[PDB]
Motif scaffolding. Structure first.
Motif, mmCIF file in Angstrom:
data_model
loop_
_atom_site.group_PDB
_atom_site.id
_atom_site.type_symbol
_atom_site.label_atom_id
_atom_site.label_comp_id
_atom_site.label_asym_id
_atom_site.label_seq_id
_atom_site.Cartn_x
_atom_site.Cartn_y
_atom_site.Cartn_z
ATOM 1 N N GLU A 865 44.524 45.168 34.278
ATOM 2 C CA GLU A 865 43.753 45.483 33.079
ATOM 3 C C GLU A 865 44.643 45.510 31.842
ATOM 4 O O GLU A 865 44.233 45.069 30.762
ATOM 5 C CB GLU A 865 43.037 46.823 33.253
ATOM 6 N N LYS A 868 44.952 42.210 30.303
ATOM 7 C CA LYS A 868 43.800 41.857 29.484
ATOM 8 C C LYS A 868 43.811 42.573 28.140
ATOM 9 O O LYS A 868 43.201 42.081 27.186
ATOM 10 C CB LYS A 868 42.500 42.167 30.232
ATOM 11 N N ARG A 872 43.814 40.595 24.559
ATOM 12 C CA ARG A 872 42.742 40.938 23.633
ATOM 13 C C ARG A 872 43.277 41.258 22.241
ATOM 14 O O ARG A 872 42.607 40.969 21.243
ATOM 15 C CB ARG A 872 41.947 42.120 24.187
ATOM 16 N N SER A 926 40.259 35.902 31.173
ATOM 17 C CA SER A 926 40.510 36.544 29.887
ATOM 18 C C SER A 926 41.868 36.134 29.328
ATOM 19 O O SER A 926 41.968 35.604 28.216
ATOM 20 C CB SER A 926 40.431 38.065 30.040
ATOM 21 N N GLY A 927 42.929 36.365 30.102
ATOM 22 C CA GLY A 927 44.268 36.097 29.601
ATOM 23 C C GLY A 927 44.552 34.616 29.436
ATOM 24 O O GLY A 927 44.969 34.169 28.363
#
Ligand SMILES: [K+]
Ligand SMILES: [K+]
Length: 2038
Positions: A865, A868, A872, A926-927
């Protein structure tokens, strides 16, 4: 970096001094060696320390002065080696230079000492390798002479020799090296050793490989000797059977003999006179050249085969006269013909010249000339390999002549071998078998087993001959009478220590035992004992154990157990003098305990206790020979017999730990190696005990766990015993369904594991093993996450991260632990902390800081997490900036001693961290997608180009890995791949390989990165056309063809493998083949067919290449060349399942159906059949084998063998049962071939079966027949296991009556001990359950043998295959409602009900997925089928115990197949709706989500595998919804799982299909699941999964089904219609319905129509703000939540409120207009939403604070502002809300302006008060700081409202709000106006007023005390007589009622006014204040609010006031506080607890 051991300076000092004093020198060096030994965690650091202190300059002085002492040499080479290690790693040029100048001559001296010591040599050889890898190689010529002198020492190990010969070869490779050897004793020194000492072990062969290479290189430099060729020839002869050594011998020979001599030799033989010197010498020379395979083709070309055959033809007439001169000629010529017969082309020529008839006719002349007969047998072996030639050889009577010759004992074992090889080669053909036994000579082979009983080496041909013939034998009588068994027994005994050779003999004895009358001939005990010994010697060999146990179950008897048990006591006592005696008894107790029918006899004598006591006797005594072997044998014995039993294992487990802790164990282990010794073996033993999970009970687990910790505690440096203990702790943690985790924590073992990991940071296997224990304990109970945090587990795994950065296995391990221990919520702030710090370092010129913070940054990024989070917050853009700076500022290299790393070491480290950061980031979508968008594929390429590596450094290799492992990830996205080619990176990568030689990891990662650019066929062609990629491809092929090192061959081949597995393109395969790979790989399997690793890797690549390329075309379309190689290797690897699989795979790809005749000619058939037989339980082998047999007689052989069975059983021969057995056995092999025409192939399957039923009913008990009949039926059932319409399979088994036959056989218990029948039989049962047409008769048949199925399971609980087959049958059987009922009512016994037994079984085979998955699937089906048929639930499922047990079987790394089966079990349990209590109790759903969560952290499975997991999870949640457990899914983030699936698998139809059906069922289950589907999931479907719903028929149809569920409820159609992308999605569905356009498309169209109509009819949009309030208010009234997070249906209500209000706010509002009063209601609604802390961040996202402040300021109607004030006032109750509210520019002045407007207004005082209270309330909540409201006139407006009150018209409530706000804003800045308005005097006055309003006094007292926060106000309060006014009030009120808040608040005022104030404390004392305080405590102390404040006053009076401490000590306060303490008696009410505290 660590510090060295301080004692190293004292050791270095000792050797620097005492260089001369030899015994002192030896002490110091012996000491320095141990500091430099890897047992020390600091060996590298210590060695560098000794280097820097100048010890080499002393050591060199010592090795010279004392050249004779080997002890010096051992120690010196150890220190030097450790330096070289630390040298290679540090890459400091200063050191590498030094250790090579001052250090290399030291080892040169050790090499020139002729060392014999394995460690001395091994350390010296490893020294030069590490020095070379460091860029400082030691001249090979300076070492060549000394290494060669090592070989004049007779007793040199083969393992040491191979390492040295390998070095000589490299040294000889130069002119200088060959010359040195030439003048230092030539080739003879080496070759004489090979001949006189060399052997045929794997290492002896590898050794001679290097010796031949040495000679070859010396030949290239004319450094060979007249002795070289003869010695080379004789070594060729010695190693004839090993092609790796032979091939390198002929290469060497080829370099001594040019091609010019070959042609002259043959032409001399053609011309020179017969009997002349030149003819004779030429024929001799031709003998030598026949050893050269590169000449053997030239001999055949020049008609040399006819010349040799003529020598024999013309010699046989002459034999009578000169038998000896002729026999010699024949010998020589026939041996040459044997060596010429290599290729299939060469064998063709021999055959064309009449070779067969010549050789066979010559055999008929040489029956009394043994040498010549052997040479002729040697020339016939390669010819007999072909079926047709072997038929010719039979016709000529060769076998019928060679057999009686062996039957009369051929004396020479060399001749006897060649003769058995020929009879064996011939026996591999089915039609010659019938000749060699059924016609005659079946037992001639058996009697020959008895002659050279121990010779067998390559001569295992006596075993193999009977191994191909025993299946045909119908009786063991002949084989016994002739002594065949005795010879094989006698053989196994001798060769019992050679693993391969004894597995063969145990297989032959197993086959003997299958023969029908074999019990009558092998039941005397001698056969049993020979197998038991073998089984004990080789427990690692599953094939030997499995074959041994089959045999024993047939022949071993009770009397076998008694005759070994009766001697147990005596054998233990006499073990010193007779250790073999006890070994034999141990072997028998061990092996016979594996026989179900015999186990109990040894436990009814408690032999385990006796053996355990015997082990202790053997340790607690003087050390004797064989003591080690005996103890290890008894440890294995006790383990096996307890495991085979079923008792609890606590006592035995403790006894083994106790045994390991005996004081003498240290002694016994001194004399052994650390890897293999009795301690290591004892820990391995009690680990296997723990693995069974048969340790139950808190007391017992604690005992066992303490005992393990004692062992670990007592042997800190046995690192293999440490490992085994860590594993044991893992198992014990899982016992009792995880309850072992609690015991492991409270015994301290969790912390002990952490402590060990901290101790051994260097040991990677220990880190993985130790963290596994901790990860296992967390996954079972997250409550130990707190403990691990307090154990500093985080620092420990942080350290292993950095130490073993490149270990992918260490990270899939620790991944869940980081998430648990990482600051879950401090990340988003702490990552942005280091993100900005790194960027700042680049803004300056601070290169160190960048590294320092990038280092820390990476530690944070590991958190899945947390990765991410970085993506972000724009890390990608950040990263592109860091790179721009790093690559630019390389002159920052000169850091000038201001950091830990300096110079170029520091540049590569920063490049390494920068690259490593993007690597962790690219974990999930995401990454990885954030980095692509940032342009980071460009920054990585730029980063790798900054690694020009002008001079390698010790962070640069790791910098490349991170850099390249990145682009592996990122480049897999099509767009970014083309940028790569644009940058010309293919070439930059290939040069990157040659920049870093010796780095297998760079090569592997560079190749995986190359294939990642070739995602499609166009880029594949771009890649393979690049010149640098061409040169790489060729240098990999070159390494496979010429590099001797096995490891480099495996690396090169792996590189090639990945290029074809990733790209998966016919153009990659094509270009790799044409580069030379096909021939080079087949050559590996030809030369290195004895090496499993090389043969498997070679086959792997060839199978990849053979899927696109016609492999035979690289051999001129003659498939026999590669086929022979495959068949040859297949036979050498027969018993290696893995190698057999990959060989059959290349064979099945190389060949086609048009090779039927070529494949039969080579005997491939029998070779493949032999494999399928041995690996009969290998799914792969049976698949590939059958596919090959479809090429070699599909359909035909099957039809013929069946009819033949009917003919046999109809005639009724006396031996029918025996005859058909061999038919069935032949048939089963064919019934594995895929059948293209099942009609023709299986014509007679039902009658054939019916004929077998008869044969079984008239001949019961024929074990072998019973087994082969089961196997055929399984093969028939397996081929159509899913097609319930096929009649030639499971249906036939039932129609023909077999199904009922098998059931009767098992019901009669006649077969229970026959595992070869039970396995296949229960598989065919499984098939008759699957086929729904057979089920009714299965049900009709089962009750008769279900109890036997239970007893059967207890018997064979130890056999994973049998267990898996039975459990699988129960799985399918449990589908029927009658079946599942019969199961529960009949399968109960000693192990419990059927559920308990299943658990026991899985626990025993916890390592076996087949058993575990079958067991979980079974429990799943059974539980569900029972509920739907009305049966009662299963107690232990409803108990939660099975769930705990099943969860324990789920380890952090359990495969995907096991995860699916566990999910299916839970799904079925949910669907049954019978086990919700247990499923909630054990938190099944939460745990499943966690596991699925972990697999995306680890990221180890393949995307297809995770597809199945998420798809499966979707189905589990679907069942949960139906089960009524939506409440459960929300405790954790259940719904979020479906959303995750949409996001990552939106393109996967088979996931979204299940996701749609899940959302549909969840929605129709719960109203809030409906909402979240509308508001959250459908927006994802219509965007992230839009193309799937559009393109896939099932996604489109299930999406429509879901929409139809959603729109069926009022209000949903409206919201869906506004969902983004729904129109594009619905339209494409319609597009899809048009394409199919049939009944399905018409149905899909009607659904869209209904959906659209539903949304149109549900487009009211009917609601106002008053509606959202009346609704929220009803909930808050009723008591429900109004948190949007927790009540999804309020989501819409809030979206509407933000919109309606947001639009109302555009204009001025009259509260008496429809939209004004509605604006009021909306603000009252927000106010309720503001009362909840969860809503704060929702309202904060919609600018709530910003809106309300705008209204309060802009709206002119006070009644509109009123309710904006209140709404914001409640939002601000929560600190973070008030924080943002009060922080936006202008809020304090604005809120005060609203106050002013109301004071100056002219409203009624009634409402003037309402408005002031509310707005002053806002002031209070917004005043987060006392200095916030300084610049605003808030004090002015507070005083005016106060003054207005003094005139009246306000109640006292206003004044309370005035006061509450005043204490929050009172500050140094308003102090001047406070004094003007006489605020203090007024408050003092109200306090003194005896008529004061009692409802106002508490706030007065409180404000007065609060105003003291200003230091000046504090003093004024004293001067104004506030303290006396307060003491007067306190005296007044203390006795009165209704004065508790006054007394309470007056004491607090006192405390605030005096706390640190000398002036007021003295005023208060003179008033008698301290006595009054004590009076408030004696009186009214029982009142908690009072007693609390009074105690707070005491503390403030005491603070920093000694005189008060003395006063109140004698004031009576102590006795008053004691009474306050005693007032307590149990109340845990919050109030009484704060009192007690103060
Ligand atoms: K020479
Ligand atoms: K033998």
């Amino acid at each position: 970096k660590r510090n060295p051991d301080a004692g190293v300076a004292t050791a270095v000092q000792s050797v620097i001094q005492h260089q001369t004093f030899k015994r002192m020198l030896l002490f110091g060096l012996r000491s320095l060696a141990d500091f430099c030994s890897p047992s020390n965690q600091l060996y590298q650091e210590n060695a560098l320390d000794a280097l820097d202190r100048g010890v080499l300059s002393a050591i060199q002085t010592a090795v010279t002065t004392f050249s004779d002492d080997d002890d010096l040499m051992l120690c010196a080479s150890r220190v030097l080696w450790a330096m070289s290690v630390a040298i290679k790693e540090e890459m400091d040029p200063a050191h590498i230079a030094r250790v090579h100048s001052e250090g290399s001559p030291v080892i040169v001296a050790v090499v020139n000492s002729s060392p014999t010591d394995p460690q001395t040599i091994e350390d010296s050889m490893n020294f030069v390798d590490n020095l070379k890898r460091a860029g400082a190689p030691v001249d090979g010529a300076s070492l060549a002479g000394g290494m060669l002198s090592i070989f004049t020492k007779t007793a040199l190990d083969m393992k040491t020799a191979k390492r040295v010969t390998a070095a000589l070869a490299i040294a000889a490779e130069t002119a200088e090296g060959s010359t040195a050897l030439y003048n230092a004793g030539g080739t003879s020194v080496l070759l004489t050793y090979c001949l006189d000492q060399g052997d045929l072990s794997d290492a002896g062969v590898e050794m001679v490989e290097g010796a031949f290479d040495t000679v070859r290189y010396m030949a290239g430099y004319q450094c060979t000797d007249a002795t070289t060729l003869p010695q080379c020839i004789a070594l060729m002869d010695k190693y004839r059977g090993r092609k790796s050594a032979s091939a390198k011998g002929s290469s060497a020979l080829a370099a001594m003999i040019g091609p010019e001599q070959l042609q002259k030799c043959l032409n001399t033989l053609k011309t020179a006179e017969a009997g002349s010197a030149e003819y004779d010498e030429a024929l001799v020379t031709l003998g030598s050249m026949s050893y050269i395979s590169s000449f053997t083709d030239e001999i055949v070309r020049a008609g040399g085969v006819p010349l040799l055959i003529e020598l024999i033809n013309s010699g046989l007439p002459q034999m009578e006269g000169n038998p000896e001169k002729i026999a010699s000629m024949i010998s020589g010529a026939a041996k040459m013909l044997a060596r010429i017969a290599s290729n299939p082309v060469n064998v063709d020529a021999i055959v064309q010249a009449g070779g067969v008839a010549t050789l066979c006719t010559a055999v008929s002349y040489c029956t009394e000339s043994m040498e010549a007969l052997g040479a002729l047998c040697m020339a016939l072996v390669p010819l007999a390999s072909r079926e047709s030639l072997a038929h010719e050889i039979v016709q000529y009577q060769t076998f019928a002549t060679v057999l009686p010759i062996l039957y009369q004992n051929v004396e020479s074992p060399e001749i006897a071998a060649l003769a058995m090889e020929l009879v064996a080669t011939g026996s591999q053909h089915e039609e010659i078998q019938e000749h060699m036994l059924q016609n005659q000579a079946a037992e001639i082979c058996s009697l020959c087993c008895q002659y050279h009983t121990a010779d067998a080496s390559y001569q295992q041909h006596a075993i193999s001959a009977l191994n191909r013939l025993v299946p045909r034998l119908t009786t063991l009588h002949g084989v016994s009478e002739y002594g065949g068994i005795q010879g094989v027994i006698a053989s196994l005994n001798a060769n019992v220590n050679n693993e391969q050779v004894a597995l063969l003999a145990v297989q032959l004895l197993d086959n003997f035992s299958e023969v029908s009358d074999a019990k009558t001939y092998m039941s005397d005990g001698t056969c049993v004992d020979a197998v038991l010994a073998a089984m004990l010697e080789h427990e690692g060999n599953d094939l030997l154990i499995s074959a041994g146990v089959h045999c024993l179950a047939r022949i071993a008897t009770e009397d076998d157990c008694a005759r070994h048990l009766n001697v147990l006591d005596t054998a233990i006592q006499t073990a010193r003098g007779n250790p073999d005696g006890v070994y034999r008894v141990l072997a028998a107790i061990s092996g016979l305990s594996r026989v179900p029918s015999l186990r109990q006899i040894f436990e009814e004598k408690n032999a385990s206790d006796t053996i355990l006591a015997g082990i202790s006797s053997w340790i607690e005594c003087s050390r004797f020979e064989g003591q080690n072997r005996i103890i290890k044998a008894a440890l294995k014995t006790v383990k096996n017999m307890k495991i085979s039993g079923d008792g609890d294992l606590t006592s035995c487990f403790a006894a083994m730990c106790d045994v390991a802790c005996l004081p003498q164990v240290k002694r016994v282990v001194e004399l052994e190696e650390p890897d293999n010794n009795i301690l290591v073996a004892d820990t391995a033993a009690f680990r296997d005990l723990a693995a069974t999970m048969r340790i139950t009970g808190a007391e017992n687990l604690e005992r066992c766990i303490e005992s393990v910790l004692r062992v670990m505690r007592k042997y800190p440096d046995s690192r293999r015993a440490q490992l085994n203990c860590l594993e044991t702790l893992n198992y014990l943690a899982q016992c009792d369904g995880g309850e072992g985790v609690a015991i492991l924590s409270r015994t301290g073992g969790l912390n002990a594991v952490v402590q060990y990991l901290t101790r051994a940071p260097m040991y990677l296997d220990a880190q993985i093993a130790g963290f596994t224990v901790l990860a296992t304990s967390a996954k079972i109970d997250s409550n130990v996450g707190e403990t691990l945090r307090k154990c500093n587990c985080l620092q420990a795994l942080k350290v292993a991260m950095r130490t073993h950065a490149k270990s992918k296995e260490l990270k899939r391990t620790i991944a869940p632990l980081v998430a648990l221990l990482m600051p879950t919520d401090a990340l988003e702030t702490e990552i942005q902390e280091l993100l900005n710090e790194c960027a700042s370092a680049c803004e300056k010129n601070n290169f160190p800081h960048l590294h320092e913070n990038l280092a820390a940054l990476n530690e944070l990024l590991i958190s899945s997490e947390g990765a991410k989070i970085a993506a972000r917050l724009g890390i990608g853009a950040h990263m592109c900036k860091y790179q721009e700076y790093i690559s630019a500022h390389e002159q920052d290299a000169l850091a000038v001693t201001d950091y830990d790393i300096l110079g170029k070491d520091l540049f590569d480290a920063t490049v390494s961290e920068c690259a490593h950061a993007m690597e962790q980031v690219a974990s999930t979508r995401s990454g990885r997608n954030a980095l692509i968008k940032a342009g980071n594929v460009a920054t990585l390429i730029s980063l790798y180009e900054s690694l020009k590596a002008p001079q390698s450094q010790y962070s640069e290799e790791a910098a490349i890995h991170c850099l390249e492992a990145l682009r592996i990830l990122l480049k897999s996205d099509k767009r970014s791949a083309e940028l790569a080619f644009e940058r010309n990176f293919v070439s930059t990568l290939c040069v990157g390989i040659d920049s870093f030689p010796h780095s297998a990891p760079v090569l592997g990662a560079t190749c995986a990165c190359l294939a990642a650019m070739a995602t499609t066929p166009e880029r594949v062609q771009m890649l393979t056309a690049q010149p640098a990629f061409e040169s790489l491809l060729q240098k990999l092929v070159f390494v496979i063809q010429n590099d001797p090192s096995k490891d480099n061959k495996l690396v090169a081949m792996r590189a090639l493998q990945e290029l074809v597995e990733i790209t998966n393109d016919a153009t990659m395969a094509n270009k790799i083949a044409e580069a030379g790979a096909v021939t080079a790989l087949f050559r590996i399997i030809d030369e290195y067919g004895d090496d499993e690793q090389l043969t498997v890797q070679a086959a792997e690549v060839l199978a990849l290449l053979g899927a696109f390329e016609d492999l035979r075309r690289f051999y001129d379309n003659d498939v026999r060349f590669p086929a022979q190689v495959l068949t040859a290797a297949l036979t050498k690897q027969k018993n290696n399942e893995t190698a057999v699989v990959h060989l059959l795979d290349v064979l099945n790809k190389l060949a086609t159906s048009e090779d039927r005749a070529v494949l039969r000619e080579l005997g491939v058939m029998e070779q493949v059949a032999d494999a399928m037989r041995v690996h009969s339980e290998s799914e792969a082998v049976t698949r590939l084998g059958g596919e090959l047999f479809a090429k070699m007689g599909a359909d035909e052989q099957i039809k013929s063998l069946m009819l033949q069975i009917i003919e046999t059983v109809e005639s009724g021969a006396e031996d029918t049962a025996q005859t058909v057995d061999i038919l069935c056995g032949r048939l089963a092999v064919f019934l594995a071939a895929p059948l293209e025409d099942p009609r023709d192939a299986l014509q007679h399957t039902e009658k054939c079966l019916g004929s077998l039923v008869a044969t079984l009913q008239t001949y019961p008990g024929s074990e072998r027949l019973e087994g082969n009949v089961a196997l055929v039926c399984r093969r028939l059932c397996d081929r159509c296991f899913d097609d319930a319409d096929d009649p030639y399979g499971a249906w036939a088994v039932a129609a023909s009556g077999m199904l009922a036959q098998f059931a009767g056989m098992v019901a009669g218990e006649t077969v229970l001990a026959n595992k070869k029948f039970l396995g296949p039989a229960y598989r065919t049962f499984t098939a008759c359950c699957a086929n729904a047409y057979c089920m009714p008769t299965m049900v009709e048949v089962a009750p008769s043998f279900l109890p036997q199925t239970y007893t059967l399971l207890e018997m064979h609980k130890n056999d994973a295959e049998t267990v898996a087959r039975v459990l699988e049958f129960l799985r399918y059987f449990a589908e029927d409602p009658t079946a599942c009922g019969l199961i529960v009512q009949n399968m109960s016994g000693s192990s419990g009900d059927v559920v308990a037994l299943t658990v026991l079984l899985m626990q025993q085979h916890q390592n076996n997925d087949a058993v575990v998955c079958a067991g979980m699937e079974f429990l799943g089906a059974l539980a569900y089928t029972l509920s739907q048929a009305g049966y009662e639930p299963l107690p232990t499922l409803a108990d939660g115990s099975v769930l705990r047990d099943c969860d324990a079987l789920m380890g952090s790394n359990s495969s995907s197949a096991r995860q699916l089966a566990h999910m299916h079990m839970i799904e079925k349990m949910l669907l049954s709706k019978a086990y919700n209590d247990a499923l909630i109790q054990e938190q099944a759903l939460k745990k499943l989500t966690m596991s699925l969560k972990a697999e995306d952290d680890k990221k180890r499975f393949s995307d297809e595998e995770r597809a199945g997991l998420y798809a499966a999870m979707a189905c589990v949640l679907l069942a949960a919804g139906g089960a009524g457990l939506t409440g459960e899914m929300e405790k954790f983030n259940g719904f979020e799982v479906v959303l995750q699936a949409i996001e990552e698998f939106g393109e996967n139809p088979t996931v979204i299909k299940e996701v749609n059906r899940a959302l549909q069922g969840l929605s129709m289950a719960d109203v809030n699941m409906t909402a979240r589907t509308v508001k959250e999931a459908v927006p994802k479907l219509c965007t992230e999964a839009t193309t799937a719903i559009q393109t896939d028929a099932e996604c489109a149809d299930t999406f429509c089904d879901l929409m139809l569920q959603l729109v069926s409820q009022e209000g949903n159609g409206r919201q869906l219609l506004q969902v983004y992308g729904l129109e594009e999605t619905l339209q494409g569905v319609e597009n899809l319905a048009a394409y199919y356009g049939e009944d399905f498309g018409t149905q899909l169209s009607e659904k869209v129509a209904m959906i659209r109509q539903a949304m149109e009819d549900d487009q009211p949009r009917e609601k106002t703000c008053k509606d959202v309030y009346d609704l929220l208010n009803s909930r808050v009234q009723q008591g429900l939540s109004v948190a949007i997070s927790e009540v999804a249906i309020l989501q819409e209500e809030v979206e509407f409120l933000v919109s309606q209000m947001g639009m109302y706010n555009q204009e001025q509002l009259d509260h008496q207009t429809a939209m004004g009063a509605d604006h009021q209601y909306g603000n009252m609604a927000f106010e309720l939403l503001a009362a909840t802390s969860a809503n704060v961040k929702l309202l904060q996202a919609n600018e709530f604070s910003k809106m309300e402040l705008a209204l309060i300021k802009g709206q002119a109607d006070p009644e509109i502002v009123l309710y904006a004030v209140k709404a914001l006032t409640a939002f601000c109750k929560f600190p973070p809300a008030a924080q943002d509210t009060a922080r936006i520019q202008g809020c304090p002045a604005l809120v005060t302006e609203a106050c002013s407007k109301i004071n100056k207004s002219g409203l009624p005082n009634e409402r003037k008060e309402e408005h002031l209270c509310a707005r002053y309330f806002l002031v209070e909540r917004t005043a987060i700081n006392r200095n916030l409201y300084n610049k605003t006139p808030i004090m002015t407006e507070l005083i005016n409202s106060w003054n207005d009150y003094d005139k009246g018209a306000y109640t006292t409530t206003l004044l309370r709000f005035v006061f509450r706000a005043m204490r929050r804003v009172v500050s140094d800045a308003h102090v001047e106006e406070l004094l003007k308005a006489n605020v203090l005097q007024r408050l003092i006055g109200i306090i003194s007023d005896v008529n004061a309003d009692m409802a106002l006094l508490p706030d007065v007292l409180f404000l007065l005390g609060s105003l003291a926060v200003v230091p000046e106000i504090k003093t004024k309060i004293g001067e104004l007589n506030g303290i006396a006014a307060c003491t007067d009030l306190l005296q007044r009120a203390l006795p009165k009622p209704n004065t508790a808040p006054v007394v309470t608040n007056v004491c607090l005022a006192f405390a605030n006014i005096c706390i640190g104030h000398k002036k007021n404390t003295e005023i208060f004392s003179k008033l008698g204040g301290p006595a009054l305080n004590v009076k408030v405590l004696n009186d009214r102390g029982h009142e908690y609010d009072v007693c609390n404040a009074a105690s707070v006053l005491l503390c403030n009076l005491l603070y920093k006031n000694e005189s008060m401490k003395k006063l109140l000590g004698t004031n009576g306060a102590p006795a008053a506080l004691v009474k306050g303490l005693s007032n307590y008696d149990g109340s845990e009410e919050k109030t009484a607890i704060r009192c007690l505290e103060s």
